[PDB]
Design a protein around this ligand. Structure first.
Ligand code: LC1
Ligand code: HG
Ligand code: ZN
Length: 256
C-alpha cells in the first residue's frame, strides 16, 4: 500500500488515486512575490482554550493527536473561512535531515518539518461528510525550524516511545495545542487538498508565515519512530512529506 518509499511513494500515488494529478493538489510552493495581500480577509480566529485531546496514534505514516470533536470546543474561523471549522486531529511531516521535511515551501525553502492542525466545516455534520465538499476542511499549517526547544511540544515528544510502531496508540488527554503556535498569525491561503492519499480536494489551506522553533533533540525523537509494525524490520519514520505540486492558476492570498 501507499507510503513514502521508492516503490510506493508520491510518484506512485496517482495509480490508485488519479486525483493526485488534479487541479487543486497540495502542497505547493508559496512564491512570496506572487502572493497578493487580500483586504477582504477577516482576522483569523484560533480558539483552542477548550480543546480536548484523547489519544495519540502511530498510523504507519505519521502520528496523529486526536481530539474529541463531538462538541464545539476548539474552532478555527475568520480569515478566508466562512463559518466554523472544528479541530479533529494534528500531525506532522518531517525529514531525515534538518534541510528537508516540510510539505509547503516558501520561495522554494524547505523547513525541517510542518505541523498540520486539521479542522472540519461544522455545517456538514461530521468529518466524513465534510471530505465530500470543496469547502469541507481547513488545515492550519505551521513550519518547524531547528533551534530553541518548543516547551509545548515536549509532552508529544515524550510519549513517542510508547507508540514506536504502526498501529500503536496511547492515552493523550489534556494536551493544549495553543502551546504549538507561533506568536504571529500572519498567513498565506489557497484552495488545495489532503497531502496524503486519498488526496481529496476539500481543503482551505492556511499556512502561517512565522515558523516555530524546536530543538535538535525534539526532531531527533520524531526520527526514532517506525513506519513498520511491531516485530517487523525497522524502517525509520522519516521523510513522510509530499513534494510541491503544480499551482495550476490558483492564487495564493496573503493576510499581511
Ligand atoms: N496532510 S493533510 O493534508 O493535513 C491530511 C491528510 C490526510 C488526512 N486524513 C485525515 C483524517 C482526519 S479524521 C480521518 N481522516 N486528516 C488528514 C489531513
Ligand atoms: Hg472535496
Ligand atoms: Zn499533513
Amino acid at each position: 500500500h501507499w507510503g513514502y518509499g521508492k516503490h510506493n511513494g508520491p510518484e506512485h500515488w496517482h495509480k490508485d488515486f488519479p486525483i493526485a494529478k488534479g487541479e487543486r493538489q497540495s502542497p505547493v510552493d508559496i512564491d512570496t512575490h506572487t502572493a497578493k495581500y487580500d483586504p477582504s480577509l477577516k482576522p483569523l480566529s484560533v480558539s483552542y482554550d477548550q480543546a480536548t485531546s484523547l489519544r495519540i496514534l502511530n498510523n504507519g505514516h505519521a502520528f496523529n493527536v486526536e481530539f474529541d470533536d463531538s462538541q464545539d470546543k476548539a474552532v478555527l474561523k475568520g480569515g478566508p473561512l466562512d463559518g466554523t471549522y472544528r479541530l479533529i486531529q494534528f500531525h506532522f511531516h518531517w525529514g531525515s535531515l534538518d534541510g528537508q521535511g516540510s510539505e509547503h515551501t516558501v520561495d522554494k525553502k524547505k523547513y525541517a518539518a510542518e505541523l498540520h492542525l486539521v479542522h472540519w466545516n461544522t455545517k456538514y455534520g461530521d468529518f466524513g461528510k465534510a471530505v465530500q465538499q470543496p469547502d469541507g476542511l481547513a488545515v492550519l499549517g505551521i513550519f518547524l525550524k531547528v533551534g530553541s526547544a518548543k516547551p509545548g511540544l515536549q509532552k508529544v515528544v515524550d510519549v513517542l516511545d510508547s507508540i514506536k510502531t504502526k498501529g500503536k496508540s496511547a492515552d493523550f488527554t489534556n494536551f493544549d495545542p495553543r502551546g504549538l503556535l507561533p506568536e504571529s498569525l500572519d498567513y498565506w491561503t489557497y484552495p488545495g487538498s489532503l497531502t496524503t492519499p486519498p488526496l481529496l480536494e476539500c481543503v482551505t489551506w492556511i499556512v502561517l508565515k512565522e515558523p516555530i522553533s524546536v530543538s535538535s533533540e525534539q526532531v531527533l525523537k520524531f526520527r526514532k519512530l517506525n513506519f513498520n509494525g511491531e516485530g517487523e524490520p525497522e524502517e525509520l519514520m522519516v521523510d513522510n512529506w509530499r513534494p510541491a505540486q503544480p499551482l495550476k492558476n490558483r492564487q495564493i492570498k496573503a493576510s499581511f
